[PDB]
Amino acid sequence: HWGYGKHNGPEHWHKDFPIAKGERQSPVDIDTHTAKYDPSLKPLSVSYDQATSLRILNNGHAFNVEFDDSQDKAVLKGGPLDGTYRLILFHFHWGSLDGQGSEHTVDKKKYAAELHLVHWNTKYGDFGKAVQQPDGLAVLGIFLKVGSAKPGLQKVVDVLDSIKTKGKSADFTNFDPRGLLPESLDYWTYPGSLTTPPLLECVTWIVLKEPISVSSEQVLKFRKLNFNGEGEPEELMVDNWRPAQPLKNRQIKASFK
Ligand SMILES: [Zn+2]
DSSP: OOOSSTTTSTTTGGGTOGGGGSSSOSOOEEOTTTSEEOTTOOOEEEEOTTOOEEEEEEOSSOEEEEEOOSSSSSEEEETTOOSOEEEEEEEEEEOSSTTOOOSSEETTBOOSEEEEEEEEEGGGSSHHHHTTSTTSEEEEEEEEEESSOOGGGHHHHHHGGGGOSBTOEEEOOSOOGGGGOOSOOOEEEEEEOOSSTTOOSOEEEEEESSOEEEOHHHHHHHTTOBSSBTTSOOOBOOOOOOOOOOOOSOOOEESOO
């Protein structure tokens, strides 16, 4: 299977997933001086007040917190989006050290981690259909930097012991994703892909300009998870991020000047 090691990592993915070398791959480096300010971009509208989280799961590559997407409870709209995108899950990519972990980079600058809040276009009926459309997904990317503790992230950090190994899951109800949002909603946006196989080029990426701060001890907890399943040799879940891909035929627009 694919992974983040030297023998099954990002550099090998193209052999099973040819699209890895596609024309719309993510992540990319955001060059702030080449990003085009676009005054026609509308403000993002993040409506997470009726969000219903269900559980948290260690899937061997990261841990996903899943939400009930049977109805328009937690939706994202506005910005560069047409229609309404429903929140289905969020996860993080992090490093073994504080100076690496994010997937997207700003002027080559890497952050400690990167939060991905995955939403799917409701016009497509279900998540499985949406991934097969060029405008099927809308992912909000938020950079994490080490500084002070994020109160709203502690609930997540506390449950990690319970899902230490691949395959483990735990009930994770009543979690409010609004506690993970930065103050400002300014962003850069561009057409891209999923950053893990199958690497489908179905995503409109919305990367927030402002990072949130988390504590060193909080990020430390992440690093204690395992890629492996129970009973197998322990491989710490660290550096589960894909490096920047060439921009090719694309433009990154900014919502701010
Ligand atoms: Zn991701």
